[PDB]
From a paper:
CD163 is an archetypal scavenger receptor and mediates detoxification of free haemoglobin. The CD163 ectodomain adopts an architecture consisting of a ‘base’, formed from SRCR domains 5–9, linked to a four-domain ‘arm’ (SRCR1-4), of which two or three domains were ordered.
In both cases, we observed a single SP domain of Hp bound to an Hb αβ-dimer, and this was coordinated by either two or three CD163 ectodomains. In both the dimer and trimer, multimer formation is mediated by the base, predominantly due to interactions between SRCR7 of one subunit and SRCR9 of its neighbour. While each arm adopts a very similar conformation, flexibility in their relative positions occurs due to rocking motion within the base. This allows the arms to emerge from the base at different angles and to make different contacts with the asymmetric HpHb head. Flexibility of the CD163 base, therefore, allows its arms to mould to the ligand, likely allowing a scavenger receptor to create different binding sites for differently structured ligands. PISA analysis shows that the arm-arm interactions have a total interface area of ~590 Å2, while the dimeric and trimeric receptors have total contact areas with HpHb of ~930 and ~1445 Å2, suggesting that HpHb will effectively compete with these arm-arm interactions and explaining why we do not see these auto-inhibited CD163 conformations in the presence of ligand.
Author numbering:
A (entry chain B): 264 to 685, 718 to 926
B (entry chain D): 2 to 142
C (entry chain F): 47 to 97, 107 to 347
D (entry chain E): 3 to 144
E (entry chain A): 152 to 689, 821 to 1030
F (entry chain G): 36 to 44
Write the structure that this text describes.
């Protein structure tokens, strides 16, 4: 007996031939396995590093067929000593002859072509100077991850492409059977056949890895903010503000794990770039997991000026850490504002905010919230940010939070949490502490009817929301017509209740009302804003007034920064900047002065977070009134 | 062949089927059309879309024929004489299709009557449907 | 001297002796038959590797015939040039008024491993309404080998009650699909009275009625015998007609064609299948072979 | 070939299967409904009545093996021919099992799946599983 | 052989007195064929083996096929021989038979037959069990019907009055199923003397066991449970002392009619009820089979079954009947009108006027075959309903066929009693007759209005009107309209109502009617008709006048006729004529009559005199008066009026206070309090002539009772002349709730 | 020698 490799791409590849009775013949491919290839290679003088099966570039078989279903355990060196049923007594045909592809290891290289970069596009094999394609006979994310992992790209998001086209085509294919997914290279995946079949009704394999387009943020002092740079596999560049949309931003903050978008900014606000400029139309539907997943338009011929960079800030921009504890899950709670650290005041801080802050740092569920200076007062300032977490989000920055002139905190009341270490909203009201009231029950949202609605009842809801006392209780659908179910008909609380579900009421579902009689509440902690003049009730040019405690008042001029006026205009929806100017002496209403010294930091989107001196009602001269004009 | 025990099991099962017979037959026809597309060749004028009233009517007709057969289990060839002549001579339905429809019927009833399909009753129903099929295809030539 | 010998699966049938000595006249003369050579006939009934069972063994006499509307039936190879089948098989896809000359050019016939053989003429029985049998003549003799071999006719009646015979068939399986591979099944001979009562009601010529559980009546008469289902309730179905009821004679190690299947419509719904006795048709068969 | 929707349906339903129960039930139903299948399992003891078949431990063990092999094929739906080469060689070389018996077992398995999963076994998933079992039977054919 | 050496045997039976007949002769056992085999042969055979009283005979090898010779065939026996071999026959061993035709016999000495009832409510209700050869077994229900139950009940010796099938309350039996397809005619002495299937071959199962319930007829009851009356609810059955439900396997109106006829509730309308209560659970059911519809009770339906089946995936039978809320009109001085009283079962009661709308009036007039609503007169009228006052908020929608179907929303408290009951009028109030004819289908036409009979004129009488008339008087299609005094001259009042019937209307009251001023007719000119007599055969304007103001509801009245206007007589004008005029011109329900004034400006001749309206019409064109006569008239003869102002308050503590009511379309109503502002309350009290407003209320002030809300969202500017000029939206449609009607308090 | 059908020498 004898062995021979014939008509392959190299002396160590091609159809397998065996001589018996002086006549050559081919082996039937049925059951041909990589073990058979290894045995046939060890019987021959070719490298034993890698052994793929199949006919590489070989033509159709001819002559006689000697053996079928050759089964080798790999324990002996010669092919014909393996197991077979009988010589020649088989029903195989010349279109299904076997083969092998011996290799030494340092020749198998995989490269993706036809797309935005090396980490996106069709998969293109090149082995022994013969270059082909992979087929979709068993292709999916499980096998996809290996190709992206092998190339230095990340997780495989989908099988598609965006940008470039016009790839070449060849009539040779790579077939995978199935490979669990943890391999360091595609070549390690078991029983990968090289050539032999032209797969019909199966298309070519395509990939788009995460490294196709990767976003980064650098130039900002608050954790989740700054200009946007995108990586094209191995190169970088800047992003203009013309072709970036909120849908893309929501994904940008989603994959970064910085929460959701709380502001999108244009221009070189975060700093002008010093590199190449990218130009790419972002067309995300909104719920995509990555920027690369979203479709993409081809590059335009134009380029933006470097003063046109973009930027974003997401919800999770509050740095919270625990100190002075034996474990990091028990120390006192600290926070930052305006470039200085500090310690949180516990004056308004419940178990819910402890649950959230424990979940933030993977400390599990919360256990207790010690009182007093139970972990040391600390050397930093005491912060006055009243937190109102709903107890489901998993970061502090997500929660509603406000500190505008919060009351002075007594010295020894520093907040702390002990971690395990493992449904009221006001709708259409504007703000958080006012509007039609709704409750979630039968797993559906519904409102409260207006009958018997009196100011005593309204006390309980805004103690439940933490919004202080009630100042109004409204009916005849003041804040719009509620939709869906109507649950609670009449309410007869004592005014001292902790939660609304403990009041005397007819019980869920019992009612005699119509949607034209939905109730509401306005409470002392609702805030609003306005810029007005003698000839306009509402505008964004004139004296600045603030709504709070049910009454209007003017904002203080002293200690007014340049960021404040920009925040004010942005909240009023006219401009991103503002200028102070002198004005007339004609006081419109001569309202009191609410809060003295406002100083808005970088990042917030409204004025209710920017910290200042605690509230106190006083009269003030017209010279102390803030008069703003928005460009 | 159908033994007395098989006939008792068939009678009990088809009694429990009851008024849902037309629904079960229509569902069986839908299963057959969805799983074996080649069977659609014999209904060229039928709107074979989902829930088509024509398919429902044909299914109820099939179920009524099966109930008539169960009533006359001892004289099935006479009970199905006209249907046998119709399928064998006028339509020339190939016998393979009948086993397909019988399997679809068994799948439908097993899906909808879990408690009744004890293996013995399953075998008896196979026997009954095989007898019906053999009667309906015997004259095929 | 030379001695004549017949190759594998053949046998010399002439008398005298096959040894021929060369003359001084340079003539080849066997001192018994003189100038006359012998001829080699074919073994009839000795399968190389004897014995719903898949056939990967020895049923060489089985033939497959397909009608011109793609219906498959069976035939039995009686000698090197003639086959024995069912008349109803030949009458497929034409009115029963059709002559034998209109049937021959419309049939395809296979033997062994899908080997095609051509048909010259067909001879139906003179009384095929009662003895449902027909003969097929091939254009040229078939070459006897491991896959093709006749099952020659019997000399005595093996249709005894209880005898188990083998029936090969190309007909429809449990899914009513024509079988891809040849199958065989072992069936016993049943007693006539039960079969007649099962299909016709009574053994009395009067007060008979059609009681066939399948709706089609077999041809039951003195030229037929019945065989029941197997130990595992396996039966013949459509397309097995024309196949032989082969009996293994252990005293002679020869396989004999005891009957040709006529009623193949039981399909496990009727208890018995009906076969045409070969011993009752042997004279007509021999007369038709010799007359052609 | 199976469309991605069909593969999704097949692999989603297959997760709720008790691999130690369904196989034995399917094999027992095959042996009862089609008696000639008992010929290959004469070593299992009493198989003469439905109760004896359904109460047999060897039947349940072998149904477990069969369903394990079936599940292995469900991960290689595009290369069934090579997945089942050794089993095909076994069933032809030693036992001589007719290829139609594979289709009978597949249909019985479909019936058992419908029986267990009730109304969730909508016609589309039935068609998908018909394609699967037809593929397995063709692969085991020879 | 004289017959001494022969011997006979019965083999393959349940015992020695049952099985296949076998005879030894010439040393061989042999059978007998079943040709011409009958009970006479069996009686002869069950005499020589000492087993007595042949019970049944068999054929076609019911006991297995035999073997050996067949000795007998086609024997004729007379029922009283010493043995089988004494009968006449063709010959020993001569036959044309085979062993598929062996004979068999069951004799009585073995089959100790008996019958019993077990596992039921009484001594003879429950499941039937038959004893055969010492073993108890059941009967399959295939072919079991009332005649079989009658035979069984008579056999066991308990009442045969009502004998129904069904194993009430009893469980499936165990053991044999001895009998099947029993075919008793109803008079046999025992269940096994009838024809039935062979004892061996049955495919039944024990869920099909048969049973009977025998009763005298005094223990079967039927009731409707769950609902606001005895005539609506789930139909429940109490047979013996067992409670159960009916199954809707074939439930329909045809048998619901039978149930309602039984209970005395009229006729069946709907297969559902209003669930006024909760009904207990029960496990036994009654199954019916296609009652013909004209049975007097549900017990007379053929083959009804009491137990022994399941109602899986089906539900309980339920019905509402005609007498559930049947209406009545009482107290009205003229046909088809008066106060309404409603029945809840078998008790008649009144309904507050605060719970009856115009849809309710339409359904009422339709149900009583009175037409369509012409007027609603809410408030004490047509006397007073001295009785019970139902407090059910009717919520009728659409135009339901019967009052019973109308959804109703009851309340748990008491309400108005003997001051605000309600009345109704419909369009079927016409008093007419035929007189002076040889038969009631021909004669003179007469019509009664007010309190006098008179002769109707033929001025506009036509064949269509004649056909409608004879359709009213049950005389079929009309034939012709003879002219003149063909049936006598006028001898009294000459009415002149010109009707305009289209001819397709069943009763003449529903036609358009015109009477005001209609043309004078002589006594010799009268209307008359002649008809087949077989039932089987099938512009004007009213205006008022005043200087510098027209179309107002105060001043002199006039009528437009034949292209010109004219005046109508002041003389003898009654209160009801004023009420009609005001309800027609729409400025009020009614008003007062006053002398003339200086505001007249047009000397127009007088068209009519002596206007007097009857009860029932809603317009002035249907009011009798003098004929047309274009005579000159003096101011003392001219008619002048002033309707009552439409806006009035009610429930107020005094005058110039109270909810704001409004009248439109015939019946009074209220206004919705959305946008209720002091401008509207300024119009309200000035319109009363009282003074400026001082306050307006919201949220259920001054009553929340009766009426439709004719207006809502009154965007009144405050200086309007009337509250109806305001741009108030969707006149008549209730967008608002009822807890929010108008209220005003204003300065005297 | 002459050949015979299906025979050898
Ligand atoms: C248990 C097996 C079957 C039964 C009992 C059955 C029963 C029936 C019945 C009751 C009819 C109506 C005949 C009439 O209205 O005059 C019918 C007609 C028909 N059957 Fe079947 N059927 C069976 C299987 C099949 C199968 C497997 C096919 C084809 C794959 C088929 C094809 C047809 C067609 C095409 C018609 C004509 C319908 C029409 O003309 O509207 N049947 N069969
Ligand atoms: C509830 O809100 C209403 C307005 O939305 C307030 O009513 C006004 O209160 C001011 C306070 O000085 C009075 O001057 C006005 O006359 C009030 N308006 C009316 C129409 O009477 C009301 O004060 C709020 N409730 C509370 C407790 O402040
Ligand atoms: Ca209210
Ligand atoms: Ca309250
Ligand atoms: Ca309320
Ligand atoms: Ca007879
Ligand atoms: Ca006779
Ligand atoms: Ca029954
Ligand atoms: Ca009866
Ligand atoms: Ca209101
Ligand atoms: Ca208004």
């Amino acid at each position: 007996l004898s062995l021979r490799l014939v008509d392959g791409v190299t002396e160590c590849s091609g159809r397998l031939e065996v001589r018996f009775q002086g006549e050559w013949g081919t082996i039937c491919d049925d059951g041909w396995d990589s073990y058979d290839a290894a045995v046939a290679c060890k019987q021959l003088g070719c490298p034993t590093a890698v052994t793929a099966i199949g006919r590489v570039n070989a033509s159709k078989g001819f002559g006689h067929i000697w053996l079928d279903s050759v089964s080798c355990q790999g324990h002996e060196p010669a092919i014909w000593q393996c197991k077979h049923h009988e010589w020649g007594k088989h029903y195989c045909n010349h279109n299904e002859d076997a083969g092998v592809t011996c290799s030494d290891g340092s020749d198998l290289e995989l490269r993706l072509r036809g797309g935005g970069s090396r980490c996106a596009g069709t998969v293109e094999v090149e082995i022994q100077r013969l270059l082909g394609k992979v087929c979709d006979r068993g292709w999916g994310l499980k096998e996809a991850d290996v190709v992206c992992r092998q190339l230095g790209c990340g997780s495989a998001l989908k099988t598609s492409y965006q940008v470039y086209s016009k790839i070449q085509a060849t009539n040779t294919w790579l077939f995978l059977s199935s490979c669990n997914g943890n391999e360091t290279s595609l070549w390690d995946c078991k029983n990968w056949q090289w050539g032999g079949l032209t797969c019909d009704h199966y298309e070519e394999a395509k990939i788009t890895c995460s490294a196709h387009r990767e976003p980064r943020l650098v130039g900002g002092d608050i954790p989740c903010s700054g200009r946007v740079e995108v990586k094209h596999g191995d190169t970088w560049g800047s992003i203009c503000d013309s072709d970036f949309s909120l849908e893309a931003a929501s994904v940008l903050c989603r994959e970064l794990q910085c929460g959701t978008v709380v502001s999108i900014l244009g221009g070189a606000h975060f700093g002008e770039g010093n590199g190449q400029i990218w130009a790419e139309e972002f067309q995300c539907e909104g719920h995509e997991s990555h920027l690369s997943l979203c479709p993409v338009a081809p590059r335009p011929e134009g380029t933006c000026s470097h003063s046109r960079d973009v930027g974003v800030v997401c919800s999770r921009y509050t740095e919270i850490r625990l100190v002075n504890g034996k474990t990091p899950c028990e120390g006192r709670v600290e926070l930052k504002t305006l470039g200085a650290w500090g310690s949180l005041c516990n004056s308004h801080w419940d178990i819910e905010d402890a649950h959230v802050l424990c979940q933030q740092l993977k400390c599990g569920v919360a256990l207790s919230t010690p009182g007093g200076a139970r972990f040391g007062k600390g050397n930093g300032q005491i912060w006055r940010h009243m937190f109102h977490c709903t107890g489901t989000e998993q970061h502090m920055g997500d929660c509603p939070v406000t500190a505008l002139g919060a009351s002075l905190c007594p010295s020894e009341q520093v907040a702390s949490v002990i971690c395990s270490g493992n449904q009221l909203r006001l709708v259409n009201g504007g703000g958080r502490c006012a509007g039609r009231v709704e409750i979630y029950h039968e797993g559906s949202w519904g409102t409260i009817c207006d009958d018997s609605w009196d100011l005593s009842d309204a006390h309980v809801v805004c103690r439940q929301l933490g919004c202080g006392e009630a100042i109004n209780a409204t009916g005849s659908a003041h804040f719009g017509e509620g939709t869906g179910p109507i649950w609670l008909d009449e309410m007869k609380c004592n005014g001292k209740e902790s939660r609304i579900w403990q009041c005397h009421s007819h019980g869920w579902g019992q009612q005699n009302c119509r949607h034209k009689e939905d109730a509401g509440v306005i409470c002392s902690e609702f805030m609003s804003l306005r810029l007005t003049s003698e000839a306009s009730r509402e505008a964004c040019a004139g004296r600045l007034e603030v709504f709070y405690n049910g009454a209007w008042g003017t904002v203080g001029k002293s200690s007014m920064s340049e960021t404040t006026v920009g925040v004010v205009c942005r909240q009023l929806g006219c401009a991103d900047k503002g200028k102070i100017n002198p004005a007339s002496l004609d006081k419109a209403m001569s309202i009191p002065m609410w809060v003295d010294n406002v100083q808005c930091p970088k990042g917030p989107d409204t004025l209710w977070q920017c910290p200042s001196s605690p509230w106190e009602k006083r009269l003030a001269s017209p010279s102390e009134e803030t008069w703003i004009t928005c460009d | 062949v159908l033994s007395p025990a098989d006939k008792t099991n068939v009678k009990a099962a088809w009694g429990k089927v009851g008024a849902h017979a037309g629904e079960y037959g229509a569902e069986a026809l839908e299963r057959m059309f969805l799983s074996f597309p080649t069977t659609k060749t014999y209904f060229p004028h039928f709107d074979l879309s989902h829930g088509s009233a024509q398919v429902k009517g044909h299914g109820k007709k099939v179920a009524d024929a099966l109930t008539n057969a169960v009533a006359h289990v001892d004289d099935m060839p006479n009970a199905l004489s006209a249907l046998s002549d119709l399928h064998a001579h006028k339509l020339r339905v190939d016998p393979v299709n009948f086993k397909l429809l019988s399997h679809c019927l068994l799948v439908t009833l097993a899906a909808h009557l879990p408690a009744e399909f004890t293996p013995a009753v399953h075998a008896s129903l196979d026997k009954f449907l095989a007898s019906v099929s053999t009667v309906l295809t015997s004259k095929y030539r | 001297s030379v001695r004549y010998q017949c190759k594998n699966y053949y046998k010399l049938r002439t008398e005298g002796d096959g040894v021929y000595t060369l003359n001084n006249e340079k003539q080849w003369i066997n001192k018994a038959v003189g100038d006359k050579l012998p001829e080699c006939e074919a073994v009839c009934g000795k399968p190389k590797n004897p014995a719903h069972l898949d056939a990967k063994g020895s049923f060489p006499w089985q033939a497959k015939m397909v009608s011109h509307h793609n219906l498959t039936t069976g035939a039995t190879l009686i000698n090197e040039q003639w086959l024995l089948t069912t008349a109803k098989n030949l009458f497929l896809n034409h009115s029963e008024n059709a002559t034998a000359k209109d049937i021959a050019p419309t049939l395809t016939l296979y033997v062994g491993k899908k080997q095609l053989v051509e048909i010259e003429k067909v001879v139906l029985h003179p009384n095929y309404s009662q003895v449902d049998i027909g003969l097929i003549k091939l254009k040229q003799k078939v070459s006897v080998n491991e896959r093709v071999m006749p099952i020659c006719l019997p000399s005595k009646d093996y249709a005894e009650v209880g005898r188990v015979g083998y029936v090969s068939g190309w007909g429809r399986n449990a899914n009513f699909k024509f079988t891809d591979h040849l199958k065989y099944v072992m069936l016993p001979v049943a007693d006539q009275d039960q079969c007649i009562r099962h299909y016709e009601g009574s053994t009395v010529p009067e007060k008979k009625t059609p009681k066939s559980p399948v709706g089609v009546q077999p041809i039951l008469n003195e030229h037929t015998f019945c065989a029941g289902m197997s130990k595992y309730q396996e039966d013949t179905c459509y397309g097995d007609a024309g196949s032989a009821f082969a009996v293994h004679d252990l005293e002679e190690d020869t396989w004999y064609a005891t009957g040709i299947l006529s009623f193949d419509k039981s399909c496990a719904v009727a208890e018995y299948g009906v076969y045409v006795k070969v011993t009752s048709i042997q004279d007509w068969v021999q007369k038709t072979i010799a007359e052609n | 070939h199976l469309t991605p929707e069909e593969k999704s349906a097949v692999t989603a339903l297959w997760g709720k299967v008790n691999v130690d129960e369904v196989g034995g039930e399917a094999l027992g139903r095959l042996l009862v409904v089609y008696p000639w299948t008992q010929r290959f399992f004469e070593s299992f003891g009493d198989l003469s009545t439905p109760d004896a078949v359904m109460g047999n431990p060897k039947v349940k063990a072998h149904g477990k093996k069969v369903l394990g092999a079936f599940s292995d094929g469900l991960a290689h739906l595009d290369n069934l021919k090579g997945t089942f080469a050794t089993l095909s060689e076994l069933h032809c070389d030693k036992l001589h099992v007719d290829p139609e018996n594979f289709r009978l077992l597949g249909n019985v398995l479909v019936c058992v799946l419908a029986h267990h999963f009730g109304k969730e076994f909508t016609p589309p998933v039935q068609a998908a599983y018909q394609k699967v079992v037809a593929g397995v039977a063709n692969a085991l054919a020879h």
